[PDB]
A paper describes a structure:
The discovery of a degenerative codon at position 228 in the human [name] A/Henan/4-10/2022 HA protein sequence, which may encode an amino acid residue G or S, suggests dynamic viral adaptation for human infection.
Next, we solved the apo structure of the HN/4-10 [name] HA by X-ray, and the complex structures with avian or human receptor analogs [LS-tetrasaccharide a (LSTa) and LS-tetrasaccharide c (LSTc)] by cryo-electron microscopy (cryo-EM). Furthermore, the RBS in the apo state and in complex with receptor analogs displayed minimal structural alteration. Comparative analysis of the overall structures between the G228 and [name] variants of HN/4-10 [name] HA revealed a remarkable similarity. Temperature-dependent circular dichroism (CD) identification showed that the midpoint transition temperatures (Tm) of [name] and G228 were not significantly different (45.4°C and 45.2°C), indicating that the HA stability was not affected by this substitution. We compared the HA surface AS of [name] [name] HA with those of Seal [name], 2004 H3N2, 2011 H3N2, 2022 H3N2. Although the AS distributions are generally similar, the AS are not conserved, and the main differences are at the AS-A and AS-B sites. The amino acid of the AS of HN/4-10 [name] HA were significantly different from those of H3N2, suggesting that seasonal influenza vaccination may not effectively protect against [name] infection. Only six glycosylation sites were found in HN/4-10 [name] HA, located at positions 22, 38, 45, 165, 285, and 483. The HA of the [name] [name] variant shows a stronger adaptation for binding to human receptors compared to the G228 variant.
Numbering used by the authors:
A (entry chain B), C (entry chain A): 10 to 326
B (entry chain S): 333 to 502
D (entry chain R): 333 to 503
E (entry chain C): 10 to 327
F (entry chain T): 332 to 503
Write the structure that this text describes.
């Protein structure tokens, strides 16, 4: 016993974890960690972002002023959530290039509206329909003015509104399409209407189309929605022979980090910086497998449901 | 890539709950087991930092394109889907290649630190011991517990036992 | 004697491959394999994908009902092939947003047509022209009805068709552009036509435009092709004052992995999972350099014509 | 990176048709050559898998955007061309970097398996032999054909020749 | 002393550089090289690309024939530079799908124009406006023919022009939008105008719009610009009831590596392949952080400002 | 760091070797001296280069592309164009980051390899005429003059000339 033995070695663990290397596909290591987040809580956290829940309303309906969407006036949001149960309960309408209008309203992040004093001489204002009820009697979209004949004459309208502020203005106007030639004359006298809205650098003119359409909430007619943007120092001129749905003012358009998302997840009281239509997810991991639609500081979307990163030597038991 | 683990070491000690690398000795006073903190912390500091440069938060995006559609439209929708599909595939390849590359390097470095500890012990016991082909050293002089502790600390002196070990060697 | 010599070494081959590494650009290894497929068989394989060759017909012309494209009625495909020699042999026409309609038809993967019983009161049907011959007699596009005046009157048309099925319908209609005012009044009593096709959530109105256009098979007139889609539980309404090229029914629109490709390669009896306009390429390699247009399980397109991956040690002589 | 091939081994044996690595011995009975299956199969199992992880089928695409145009159009066509160009350039970089990285590791791992065989032999012949600087070993005792086969098998015992070799090495 | 000592080692440096590895983030190496170009000279080199500076003119205004842009006729370029100080000084107008027209003109790389002998019977030609002055007299966009009524009648226009060449013809025309019905009838006898421009494979018809608009250079009316391309062996037919802004010929359209860039940097005499709006940058590095808009042989844009690449061992001085 | 030579059994680097990247230092009866090894230096430099050229080589010519800055809000198309550019920039930023980190790690590892290879070769050359301390230095056990050191550095060292001298001075 004038000798001694000295051995060198490394730890082993009773249970390893399988990872993927370059030279091998199934190799066991002592410890490993998961790089892909494949679960969601299902509860959209209301912090730190400002989440606005549109219960039965879309963004355009709230922007237009649907009577059942009236609680959303002058609202602001970091992320607007559109539920699949949303419906329209006002005058039937369509928006040419609907997606672009929805996108720019969502990016603006606000519905702040400023009423301007338009003067419509020789025509009656504040039209309403049985298709758009505000309580017990007829109503219309807010932020919009339906103009019809005053007596037996519909005069030519030529109104102007300069932009004396230092921020851009967004105007929402419309054109009414009657279903019969008689309805056109009964409301606007002239047999062929015309709406022109233009500025120093852009123009738009729409000729209404008369014809029967599917009967939605009692109306065989339709309304087409259009928008115009007036830069500071520019001026807006509206010229109409008839069939004009006049604006009531302008929307203040801002530049920010707001957006819109379609989801049916409930909103709870919690903190999470990443929002998906499936709910909120933590962002401790670099990747995630829940949804490719995200908002906030989120892990990048990948197709793999699991990716193990080795945090120990190979397990030789 | 260095031998060592799954190599000239044969097996891993299930029971070293003190550290990642260590020593085991058979002595005239008895057998013992210790852990090495320099190599264990060097490895842990390398798996860490690797973890942090991967975990570090990025990808703060607020407004993007639409990625789910209810109506078939044609050119623009096809463009938006092709853009999203291309992005997802490129990142998925980036995730797969990263994991495979890092995992191989993790295995390679853990071999290195054991080989480095083995050669450090070899250079300490200059001619007083020789390499058995199992990662164990046969010391040819009487080496008590204080003697083993000096080897583990790095304060071993070969001149003390050189002529004793050389006699028992040759 | 009283000794021995033991040497350790590795194999060498009389001929190596040049591969590329990180440190060097020209290093020799014993074995290597190619990762880039740079060749095609020139024959488009008819398996396992269902390839349909439209010899002298484009997909739109087959959809419309060109008389020389009549053999393509109620066809289905996985990949439609359009030949460069395809032509049109019917009434001259243009399709606003042509590419989108071509895209959705190709992705639908079928031309399954269902005839519906439309009632056009007060007008004569089944119009034809010398520009579109069906045998020795004047003809017209199938799946399309040319309506003109009956006697000396052209009544207003107001017809409806609900969607009582559980799948979407695709309707193809058209608007006629006469070359002169006298021709417009001759075919339709009214001096200016109008076509309105709408659903409960959309509308399209076209006002035809009179004027000469280039001689195409004896016709200075043109036809504009449009399309509408009706969801289940929705209804279709068509209101026209004249110039209407009415539909004869709807197309059944499906969701699948079908597409279209422009190629002039022949089709043979063989099996290949990847199709390119140059032909079918094997997919035993991760990358390919034949074409950036592919269909099926295909290698990814790269610019490099060769990428050698080492499968052996360095070659040392 | 480990010094074996293109290093302290000098040359490669063009003529080993049995395996990737092996032994050549000079003996009183005569010269001979053998092959080591363990290291060769270990390297082959590593070049494979690397091959399979790269060769596995990944993408199945059916309907996409157009990539060739017959008429100039403007904005939408410019976007479609830019998207395809961006995709192709990115994958081309991925293909180039992947090949360069795998080939570097393939060269390195083949040095490792060779250096590991050399170091295993040196640890096996503890004091009965010593290095020469060319990948060879000068064995300081009589070693017949069965003696060599015991070294290649790994069943070599150093005590049977310890005293004989030590005297031949030293005084 | 019967023994000697031989030591092996590596060099150190009194001053190292910090790089980033996979395992560590801050590690010192003996030498390193920068991989990202993060500075611009500010001077756009005039070689080897042919850079055309449009001082007070946009590409569309130069193509149309704005009088203060007449110096740009029949020009050619590799990069067209649009300065922020440009303006329009002719009849107010708008271009439906303006970006596409600008993009295809910029890619063509030429403004070479060929006059063709159109015959407009029954109408007066070469009309002008006080909003577009050529010296002291009223004028109009060149390459553009304003047609109005002759006497008291405005006949139907039905003209044809075939493409008997082996290259594509680019045509530019327009429609005039009156502000009142009394003006529409004054200029064109017909109450409702119509313009149809068609080929054997495509058609375009526009209906003029009547309405008051903000005054731009004293004009309440507008003009809309449209373009048509005639393939070789095709034919052009223009049919109009009025409100037609006729073309004077066709623009030669080429395929090339030309483009357009918006910048305010000055142009100097120097050599550089890569042009950014911030100026020219060298291309000896694989990445750059100056601008994501580039032209020529340029480093790829990255978000990082610095990327040190190691070119030596680790620096271990004590 | 993966081979344990630099920041390892070498301890420190010689600030003052202006002749090469690796060299020898000896203490002798005649006096101390210093030399440089061109083979290991040129091997490391040739590997640092080529590495540089593979990264530096120009691979990008683009002339006409999409608009990347906008002055008016438009909607769908502008959203798509910005999203494409953002995706491209992020992907290339990741590629640059991963490339630099990977190349730097391999740069450190190959410098250790060249140093450890030089140390191991000298051990084979000084077969039994010297033994190793854990400091990266060798202790030669025979009278080795300046011409003797130059022969070791060249590689023309003959151990048989000094074998019995060293074995006697090593073992009693
Ligand atoms: C507005 O302006 C346009 C053109 O400015 C007029 O359109 C032209 O209409 C005439 C017919 O009135 C067209 O002429 C016809 O061309 C046919 C052949 O076309 C060409 O192509 C073939 C090859 O495909 C060549 O071989 C041939 O040489 C031509 O170059 C002829 O087949 C037609 O037949 C004529 O002759 C026979 C006698 O041989 C008669 O029986 C026929 O009735 C007819 O007279 C004829 O020649 C001409 O091509 C049209 N041009 C364009 C550009 O479309 C509009 O008519 C005009 N509108 C008004 C209201 O004025
Ligand atoms: C043109 O045709 C359309 C349909 O082809 C006609 O519209 C239809 O009008 C009737 C009323 O006249 C609608 O009936 C209503 O149904 C509700 C229940 O849904 C009922 O409560 C009402 O009392 C009323 O009966 C019918 O729904 C509607 N159909 C469509 C598709 O809109 C239209 O009247 C025709 N126009 C002309 C001028 O003939
Ligand atoms: C419809 O409304 C628009 C704008 O509200 C009117 O346009 C304006 O027309 C007047 C001309 O009557 C322009 O004023 C001119 O100013 C100069 C001095 O700079 C003066 O010398 C002229 O005699 C004239 O007064 C004014 O600039 C112009 N403004 C805009 C924004 O276009 C238009 O006249 C109205 N039309 C009708 C029929 O009411
Ligand atoms: C998150 O929600 C999405 C819904 O958008 C889920 O994706 C769908 O999952 C169903 C059920 O497997 C499939 O039939 C659909 O085809 C999926 N749609 C898409 C667009 O992928 C997703 O599975 C959910 N993920 C989690 C983790 O809850
Ligand atoms: C090097 O040449 C050898 C032949 O000596 C090639 O290998 C075999 O060559 C024979 C013909 O001599 C063929 O029948 C075999 O099919 C070949 N086998 C393989 C696996 O290739 C070898 O391919 C050549 N290698 C290089 C890099 O040129
Ligand atoms: C060169 O390498 C290839 C592998 O890339 C060897 O061929 C492989 O053999 C295996 C069976 O052992 C098959 O599963 C693979 O599909 C084959 N691949 C190829 C590309 O042939 C080939 O034998 C090697 N040749 C030499 C001389 O080393
Ligand atoms: C594995 O490593 C993580 C840190 O990366 C640590 O939190 C965890 O406790 C470790 N698990 C085991 C079993 O070592
Ligand atoms: C494939 O066809 C294209 C034409 O679309 C041609 O440019 C290319 O060179 C062809 N490639 C091969 C490998 O045939
Ligand atoms: C270090 O790199 C710089 C270039 O950045 C070069 O000028 C210098 O000569 C290099 N020095 C060494 C020792 O490589
Ligand atoms: C280049 O100019 C852009 C303005 O488009 C600016 O955002 C950026 O900071 C500038 N960069 C440099 C390096 O000048």
């Amino acid at each position: 016993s004038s000798t001694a033995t000295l051995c060198l070695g490394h730890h082993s663990v009773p249970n390893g974890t399988i990872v993927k290397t370059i030279t091998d596909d199934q190799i066991e290591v002592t410890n490993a960690t998961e790089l892909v987040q494949n679960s969601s809580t299902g509860k959209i956290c209301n912090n730190p972002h400002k989440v606005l829940d549109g219960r039965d309303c879309t963004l355009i309906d709230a922007m237009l002023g649907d009577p059942h969407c009236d609680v959303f006036q002058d609202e602001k949001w970091d992320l607007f959530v559109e539920r699949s149960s949303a419906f329209s309960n006002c005058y039937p309408y369509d928006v040419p290039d609907y997606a672009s209008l929805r996108s720019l309203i969502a990016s603006s992040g606000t519905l702040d509206f400023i009423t301007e004093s338009f003067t419509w001489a020789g025509v009656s204002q504040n039209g309403g329909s049985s298709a758009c009820k505000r309580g017990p009697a007829n109503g219309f979209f807010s932020r919009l003015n339906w103009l019809t004949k005053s007596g037996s004459s519909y005069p030519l309208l030529n109104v102007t509104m300069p932009n004396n502020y230092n921020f851009d203005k967004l105007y929402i106007w419309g054109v009414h399409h009657p279903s019969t030639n008689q309805e056109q004359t009964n409301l606007y006298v002239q047999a062929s209407g015309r709406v022109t809205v233009s500025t120093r650098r852009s123009q738009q003119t729409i000729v209404p189309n008369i014809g029967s359409r599917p009967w939605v909430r009692g109306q065989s007619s339709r309304i087409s929605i259009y928008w115009t943007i007036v830069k500071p120092g520019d001026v807006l001129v509206i010229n109409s022979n008839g069939n004009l749905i006049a604006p009531r003012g302008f929307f203040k358009i801002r530049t920010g980090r707001s957006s819109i998302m379609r989801s049916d997840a409930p909103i709870e009281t919690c903190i999470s910086e990443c929002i998906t239509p499936n709910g909120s997810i933590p962002n401790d991991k670099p990747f995630q497998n829940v949804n490719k639609i995200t908002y906030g500081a989120c892990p990048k979307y990948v197709k793999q449901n699991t990716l193990k990163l080795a945090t120990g030597m190979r397990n030789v038991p | 890539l260095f031998g060592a683990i799954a190599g000239f070491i044969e097996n891993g000690w299930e029971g070293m709950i003190d550290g990642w690398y260590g020593f085991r000795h058979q002595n005239s006073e008895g057998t013992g087991q210790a852990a090495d903190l320099k190599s264990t912390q060097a490895a842990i500091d390398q798996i860490n930092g690797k973890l942090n440069r991967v975990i570090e938060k990025t990808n703060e995006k607020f407004h993007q394109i639409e990625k789910e559609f209810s109506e078939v439209e044609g050119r623009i929708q096809d463009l938006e889907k092709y853009v999203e599909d291309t992005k997802v595939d490129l990142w998925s390849y980036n995730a797969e290649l990263l994991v495979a590359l890092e995992n191989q390097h993790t295995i390679d470095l853990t071999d290195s630190e054991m080989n480095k500890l083995f050669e450090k012990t070899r250079r300490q016991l200059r001619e007083n011991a020789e390499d058995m082909g199992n990662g164990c050293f046969k010391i040819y002089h009487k080496c008590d517990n204080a003697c083993i502790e000096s080897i583990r600390n790095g304060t071993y002196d070969h001149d003390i036992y050189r002529d004793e070990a050389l006699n028992n060697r040759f």
